[PDB]
Write a protein that binds this ligand. Structure first.
Ligand SMILES: [Mg+2]
Ligand SMILES: [Mg+2]
Lengths: 297, 296, 296, 296
């Protein structure tokens, strides 16, 4: 009987212009997502360079997301994690206070908590707010893995925790998850394997590619949720080349490059330690892009 | 292309007093046939191919071919080697013993390059006129057949029709079928049978089906009939046993399970394989309690 | 280049009632000074830098700086972040607080490219005029500072004088010192302190030294004098404790050990870090009985 | 225990017209002897053991044994298998041909358990009365001989005297020699020859010494004499070639290098091994130019 946020979702890039958050660009990109069938937007996740934004920039992009999605069906699943439990709790309350429909909370990075620590970490977050909480497992970035058992325990013990965004290249784990707890919302955080995760009972994606091709990712997800597996697989197969090229360098360097190449943002700006891609990868992204039809504003 | 697909079983090789129990072997193959299996794989990894003599190799292929006569069930004989000259000989020998096709594992230990793997399989494919299925299991061989190499071999050689993937890498299975949708992707990883079938895979070469042939058969055929809800339901249902059968290196758990179920008479391996630990014995037994194990 | 080398300790940060036990911190540092340690590292990974406020970062740097005045012991302050603008600020801040140098961990989580890491560390190095030691620990950060990037930063930037390696990769430590023998390679992995020192490493930033500073100090200085025999013998003796201190994620075992001794009064962590399991707890307690633990 | 240690070479096996070039094999061996090598390893991994017939196996051991008679140089014959019965046969086979000891690789592909590895090697060790060196190369075999199993085999079996480690794991080499300092740890990884020797290792089984036997010999001897400064410098000098010799799977680069230097007449392999890419060919040739290569 849990409240959930599922479907086609986009981990929004955060455009910079002259080192500032391009707030009008942010709103325009979100409207573009809404107009192409996206079900929810994820402000200031990994793809939004959450690590290099200030807390005010944090609030500004959640507020823009919440405003722009008002009066539409599109929900706002705000990035609000940290590797310090006390800060993650504050960011959760902060996100709720700004009107987010739920929070995406990344597993603590760098300090490698144990499974017991991860349980108490997320339990403290879940008890702090009364909006849905989606776990976020990306061990290649955090250095830790939320075990299947820990995810299931958190799902069963805490009311707001309703699923997990898996970015782990481990379809075995997604079988494990849904075989032992079929009530949870398994969310793909790995564009290349969107369809295999959905076809096994996953209920959504939090996509990088959808920044560039929101119509294609949304269509894929809705095909799969409607059990039209043949058409969902067909879009997944078509998207493989771009899905992979968007990680030739660390996300979000390629996707922001692609967004700039398509004319969707005004300046290829990052905040250090992130930076422009290599010129060979610049050309690689530009070539893979030309084979896809990119909607405008 | 001529193909061999569907639900397939990597047959264990039972031993009695250190020798191949040929009657048990035939009885086990008949059990597979009667539970809906589409093909059997003699002397694969699960069949302890490494420790059988060539002569035992022939004996197990012949029993498989003889036991499948008068049925639709094909024999996809294990016939690989990390020496190309030997792999060619095993392919030709498998064909001469009546196999319908060969499963040919990527060279283990000596780590050929992608160029070497191409020439290896091309020499095998040109040696026979029966279907050849590639077999990628990097955790055992120390090498990986890249997507590009698999696709090139599929396109350049008439007998090569697909690959048995045992790599825990669903991304690669998207890669394979997205760029070459005509190939037969075969799952060599029981736990992810359904995700591979759901992405367009056309069969399984199963370990679990030694113990639960009816469930693996039903899973595969549901998926091939695009009844994905029913295939997933068996896959989720099989997860516990699918994993426990790898608590020690295959085929140590599956032979242990077969012995616990009374399907083979003696828990015998050939060294360097051996009985499992007493705790893993108990674990296999416990996981087994939740499943319905067909007899003979 | 100005350098900070020798036997160094990544200081734990004791908590009492959820606050930094300031008295305890100073007393622990004094214990380190009195047992031959050459530098202390406040608020590194072992110091739970991730869960301390900027206020608390300052407090432990200030305590470290004041406690080492009038001694030969240097303060190499932890001052890294995965945001370059913040890493520059923390570097400047550490400087103003009287730190002798900074340890700056590779950006975690956001996985910068080698180009990004170069610009990141170049911005830090140009922000201060005190030595900067790079810190590569890919198991925690998700990224690796390549040998090429480390060498470029060492050669291009004045203050960058070496790297604290915690990567379990002795090949990389050969690579580093073979192509740039002027850099200070620092072991960030206690179990392999001696192999790194014997290949030209010039110090350690130790976890074990929290509990056994005299033994790590002796190991390092034996090695720096090319008394390899004595350095290896201490390294071999410490292997058991060096490993058990990572049965769970550092600093959970070392803080447990410090509590099991008489050195901190409360086994407190800041979530998501927490007390170890009970079996690891007895496990740390059993191994400790083998070593002689200095008091205050 | 009887031991075979010092500077040792994993001999390449030259082929000419698809056959073992027996006169070249002998010329190369003599070359090794004349440049200070202490033992030669016929038909190991670098000798393409996987693609030689058993008669060619016998031929290359016999040539090694005959060429080393009347010298100090020992012959440590490759004689491993992933089937214990065959590995036992190959061990007895090597002893009857006059080998001084055997190198026996851990079973590849079929991934035996630690218990299985113990029984595998115990059967081999009890089969012969000549020294047995274990060989751990998990990147190629798919398995790993644990420290505990290595130590158990060393303590339980008289002729098992050490291990040739090719695992890029200096922590394990500390673990091994800290808990069992009497065993002979042998480097199977040229780039980290010095770190392994400096920790108490007593020899190397080298790929690089095929091309530069004098340099590997001096390195090893300097180290055995505790002249670590001279051993480390040679190790640092050799790093580039040590790494480039694995741009592609060994022995593809070393045979390419041997051919480029004129030490072998034909760049021939047995499939699935083959010529390197022309990019990597050029790279091997460039790296070579910095080293002084001895002739015959
Ligand atoms: Mg730091
Ligand atoms: Mg650490």
């Amino acid at each position: 009987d849990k409240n959930i946020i599922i479907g086609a979702m986009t981990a929004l890039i955060t455009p910079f212009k002259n080192g500032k958050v391009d707030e009008q660009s942010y709103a325009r990109l979100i409207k573009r997502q809404i107009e192409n069938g996206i079900d929810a937007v994820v402000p200031v996740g990994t793809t939004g360079e959450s690590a290099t934004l200030t807390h005010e920039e944090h609030r500004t992009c959640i507020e823009i997301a919440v405003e722009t999605c008002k009066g539409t069906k599109v929900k706002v699943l705000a990035g609000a994690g940290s590797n310090a439990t006390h800060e993650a709790v504050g960011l959760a309350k902060f996100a709720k206070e700004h009107g987010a429909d739920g929070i995406l909370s990344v597993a603590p990075y760098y300090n490698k908590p144990t499974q017991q620590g991860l349980y108490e970490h997320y339990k403290a977050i879940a008890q702090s707010v009364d909006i849905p909480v989606l776990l976020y497992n990306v061990p290649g970035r955090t250095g830790c893995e939320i075990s299947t058992d820990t995810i299931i325990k958190l799902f069963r013990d805490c009311e707001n925790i309703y699923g997990v965004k898996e970015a782990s290249g481990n379809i075995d784990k997604c079988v494990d998850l849904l075989a032992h707890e079929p009530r949870m919302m398994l969310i793909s955080g790995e564009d290349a394997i969107n369809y295999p995760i959905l076809s096994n009972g996953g209920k959504g994606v939090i996509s990088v590619t959808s920044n560039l091709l929101p119509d294609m990712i949304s269509a894929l997800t809705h095909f799969a949720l409607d059990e039209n597996y043949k058409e969902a697989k067909k879009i997944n197969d078509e998207l493989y080349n771009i899905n992979k090229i968007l990680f030739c360098e660390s996300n979000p360097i390629p996707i922001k490059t692609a967004m700039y190449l398509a004319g969707l943002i005004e300046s290829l700006e990052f905040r250090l330690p992130l930076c422009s891609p290599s010129k060979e990868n610049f050309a690689k992204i530009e070539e893979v892009m030309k084979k896809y039809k990119i909607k405008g504003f």
